[PDB]
């Protein structure tokens, strides 16, 4: 019955200080909601830095640290590793159950930054007798490795029968994605403009074909 | 100290599931048992506990009269069981282990079971090229509507082993369905054929696709 937010995701350099924050849409963050950071590393790998706000537990490369700023409570990596560059969950207590945030996705430059390299395909022919088209938008090469994914088909915006997969990251170290809009091939005769446009960085392309 | 529990299962929709986890190491009384459900693409989320001792557990109401945590003392095995199982209970599902409030946190995590909620009988995919309709050039396999995973995509019997990209696969229809996109240079195509190699052993089925231009 509580939310618990945590920033998108965070750019910090190697020797950097970055620092995390956990918000509570029920109240600044009481020493009673005892934020348990928890790192993801791929391929499912869990564990805690820190509990009870203050507390690291054992083993935890003293760099990682809590605390609280203003209202909301902290995790402050101290000379941020390139081994850091993983998703962090934070926990928050409240009298009887627990409740995991939005996490962070951090990205620890280890490159230079990259921009996504797009390219949306048609719905090939066999598969329109079969009275299916979908259509397939790629992404790869972009770097950090978070993009938003955005369909318009004829210039309206679609909010169904589109799934992306989680950013992957590639053999360079530079992330890929794919996204996939579903269509009856009857809905694709329908409308006529189509385009897939990813953001990365705040920055958009667009890659449209007409039918 | 590891908590082991098993790493899959298959389960059809409207059964239910009994996961386990098998606490190996120094204690499960001075622990408490935690479960956490990830589904990719939304983080975690607290499923309860469950108290060793006494059996006396506390849950998030999402999933009130969905999960019900046991333990089972002389084994130091911690069970959730899931009724009534749909296609959102899909998910990588975790038993973490927690220290007294006493420093407070998730200390040890185990590595999380793979539920798979799903009708869906082995099912071969269904090769379908990815073509430009226009310097290099971006040339794809769209392998969709496969079960089970997981499908082997190569290019040109290994021959083009860069500018290939193979993604993960996205659930939806209770079957899987990825690509691969190759970016062979401007000069190859049209001109040298291009072929991807789609494998899907779970069903033995091996399949060529010639991307053609159209």
């Known amino acids: 019955q509580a939310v618990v937010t945590q920033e998108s995701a965070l750019t910090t350099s190697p020797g950097e200080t970055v620092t995390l924050t956990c918000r509570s849409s029920?109240?600044?963050?009481?020493?009673?909601?005892?934020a348990n950071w928890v790192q993801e590393k791929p391929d499912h790998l869990f564990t805690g830095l820190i509990g009870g706000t203050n507390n690291r537990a054992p083993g935890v490369p003293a760099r990682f640290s809590g605390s609280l700023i203003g209202d909301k409570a902290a995790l402050t990596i101290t000379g941020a590793q390139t081994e850091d560059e993983a998703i962090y969950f934070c926990?928050?207590?409240?009298?009887?159950?627990?409740?995991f945030g939005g996490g962070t996705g951090l990205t620890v430059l280890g490159q230079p930054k990259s921009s996504p390299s797009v390219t949306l395909f048609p719905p090939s022919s066999e598969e329109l007798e079969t009275n299916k088209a979908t259509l397939v938008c790629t992404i790869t090469d972009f770097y950090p490795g978070v993009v938003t994914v955005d369909w318009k088909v004829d210039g309206t915006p679609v909010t169904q029968g589109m799934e992306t997969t989680q950013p992957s990251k590639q053999s360079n170290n530079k992330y890929m994605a794919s996204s996939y809009l579903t269509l009856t091939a009857r809905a694709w005769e329908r409308h006529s403009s189509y385009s897939c446009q990813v953001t990365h960085e705040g920055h958009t392309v667009e890659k449209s074909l007409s039918r | 100290v590891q908590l082991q529990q098993p790493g899959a299962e298959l389960v059809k929709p409207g059964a239910s599931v009994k996961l386990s986890c098998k606490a190996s190491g120094y204690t499960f009384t001075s622990y408490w048992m935690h479960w956490v459900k990830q589904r990719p693409g939304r983080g975690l989320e607290w499923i309860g506990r469950?108290?060793?001792?006494?059996?006396?557990?506390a849950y998030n109401e999402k999933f009130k009269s969905k999960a019900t945590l046991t333990v089972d003392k002389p084994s130091s095995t911690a069970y959730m069981q899931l009724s009534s199982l749909t296609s959102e209970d899909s998910a990588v599902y975790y038993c973490a282990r927690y220290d007294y409030y006493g420093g407070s946190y998730f200390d040890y995590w185990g590595q999380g079971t793979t539920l798979t909620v799903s009708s869906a009988k082995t099912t071969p995919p269904s090769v379908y090229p990815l073509a430009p309709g226009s310097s290099m050039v971006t040339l794809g396999c769209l392998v969709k509507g496969y079960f089970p995973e997981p499908v082997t995509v190569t290019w040109n019997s290994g021959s083009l082993s860069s500018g290939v990209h193979t993604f993960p696969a996205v659930l939806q229809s209770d079957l899987y369905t990825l690509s691969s996109s190759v970016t062979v240079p401007s000069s190859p195509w049209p001109s040298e054929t291009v072929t991807c190699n789609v494998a899907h052993p779970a069903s033995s089925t091996k399949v060529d696709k010639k991307i053609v231009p159209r």
């Open positions: 029920t109240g600044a963050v009481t020493t009673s909601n005892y």
């Open positions: 469950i108290d060793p001792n006494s059996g006396g557990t």
């Open positions: 926990a928050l207590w409240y009298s009887n159950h627990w409740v």
